[PDB]
Enzyme design. Structure first.
Site, short mmCIF file in Angstrom:
data_model
loop_
_atom_site.label_atom_id
_atom_site.label_comp_id
_atom_site.label_asym_id
_atom_site.label_seq_id
_atom_site.Cartn_x
_atom_site.Cartn_y
_atom_site.Cartn_z
N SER A 110 0.82 -1.26 -0.01
CA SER A 110 -0.02 -0.14 0.15
C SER A 110 0.95 1.34 0.05
O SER A 110 1.78 1.56 -0.80
CB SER A 110 -0.82 -0.19 1.27
OG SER A 110 -2.05 0.60 1.35
N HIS A 154 -8.50 0.84 -1.56
CA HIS A 154 -8.12 -0.39 -2.81
C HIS A 154 -9.25 -0.77 -3.39
O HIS A 154 -9.55 -1.97 -3.39
CB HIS A 154 -7.38 -1.43 -2.25
CG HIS A 154 -6.01 -0.76 -1.94
ND1 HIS A 154 -5.13 -0.38 -2.66
CD2 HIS A 154 -5.24 -0.52 -0.62
CE1 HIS A 154 -4.06 0.17 -2.28
NE2 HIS A 154 -3.93 0.11 -0.88
#
Ligand code: CL
Length: 372
Positions: free
Chosen positions: A147, A249
């Site tokens: 991430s 996401h």
């Protein structure tokens, strides 16, 4: 520090046995300042080309004696390699080993929190970690970032300087918190990717993070996650809601692409000079356009399982705050330890530096003892 780093080495395993026996004798019943002297002296005398290596992160002399006993017992039965990340104990005869770096994302300790605050805080800790590896001359084989961590991995690999990276993290944190409207969030499944896709099929929820064979997180609005939670209960799959107020996401982050594309587009991007296993593409970074990759990272899944599988490394060191990625790596049967950069406690610094020294990725532990 609450943990002391004790390193030493010798020309071969027989010589290392002799040294550890002498150190064990010298360590019994030392007070804390005496142990610090013993440790600082060993780091000064055992640095450079040190063929056979021991390193342990210890709370006191008795922890040091316990570590020496394990290493001595290991050598005694002909062992050449003992890597116990959870006890901060590393012994390597005939390294160097291959070491990879892991850079954490959010959901990492912030030295739920606002993502506009957390993102630059975490990246500031990771960048301090990178300054530590630089002070040590560390030679890892490659890095991955989970991430937000992809930004720190890219800064480690020379694609972007530290100051621009921290600036990007601030802008990204602001853009991401600006994006959602309708209540949304994330649900962690103790299940593999195919099981998560089966549970999510036709619900509106999507895969957000692929961490491993037993850990996949889905993201969606609240009604979408409720459909998956219902399906998971019926299938007997354990589903844990995450304390986050945004899908991350997922396509619900698309409105951030404008702000992030602008922020990223002005920066002096360079080709990475060190290997980076991307959790956006799940592949080695090979001349991607970093702006396009960072934009699709907003809405696509975190490919951590795939990226970790590419990183061929005997030992992984997490360079950032907390120990989330080392926990994920150990869940995949990998050996991992965290530097826990920015923490109040020196535990992670000592354990991480011990791993880097015993693996042969750094040759000199003396910076641990400077400026006390
Ligand atoms: Cl130094």
């Amino acid at each position: 520090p609450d943990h002391e780093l004790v390193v030493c080495g010798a020309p071969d395993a027989a010589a290392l046995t002799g040294l550890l026996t002498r150190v064990r004798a010298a360590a019994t019943a030392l007070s804390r300042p005496e142990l610090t002297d013993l440790a600082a002296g060993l780091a000064a005398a055992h640095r450079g080309d040190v063929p056979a290596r021991f390193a342990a992160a210890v709370r006191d002399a008795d922890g040091l004696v316990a570590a020496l006993d394990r290493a001595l017992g290991h050598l005694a039965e002909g062992g050449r390699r003992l890597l116990d990340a959870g006890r901060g104990l590393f012994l390597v005869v005939g390294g160097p080993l291959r070491v990879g770096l892991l850079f954490p994302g959010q959901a990492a300790p912030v030295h739920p929190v606002d993502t506009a605050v957390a993102q630059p805080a975490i990246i500031a800790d990771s960048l301090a970690g990178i300054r530590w590896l630089d002070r040590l001359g560390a030679r890892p084989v490659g890095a991955l970032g989970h991430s937000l961590g992809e930004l720190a991995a890219l800064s480690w690999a020379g694609a972007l300087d530290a100051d621009d990276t921290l600036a990007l993290a601030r802008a990204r944190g602001e853009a991401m918190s600006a994006a959602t409207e309708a209540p949304s969030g994330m649900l962690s499944l103790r299940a593999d990717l195919a099981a998560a896709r089966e549970l999510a099929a036709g619900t509106g929820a999507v895969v957000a993070v692929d961490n491993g064979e037993r850990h996949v997180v889905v993201a969606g609005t609240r009604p979408e996650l409720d459909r998956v939670a219902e399906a998971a209960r019926h299938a007997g799959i354990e589903a844990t809601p995450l304390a986050v107020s945004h899908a991350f996401h997922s396509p619900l982050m698309a409105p951030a692409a404008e702000a992030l594309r602008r922020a990223a587009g002005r920066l002096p991007w360079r080709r990475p000079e060190r290997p980076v296993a991307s959790t956006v593409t799940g592949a080695w970074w090979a001349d991607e356009d970093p702006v396009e990759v960072l934009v699709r990272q907003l809405t696509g899944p975190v490919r951590f399982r795939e990226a970790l599988g590419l990183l061929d490394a005997d030992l992984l060191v997490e360079v950032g705050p907390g120990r989330m990625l080392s926990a994920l790596a150990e869940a995949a049967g990998r050996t991992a330890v965290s530097l826990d950069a920015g923490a109040a406690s020196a535990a992670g610094m000592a354990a991480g530096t011990a791993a880097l020294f015993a693996a042969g990725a750094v040759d000199d532990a003396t910076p641990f003892f400077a400026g006390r």
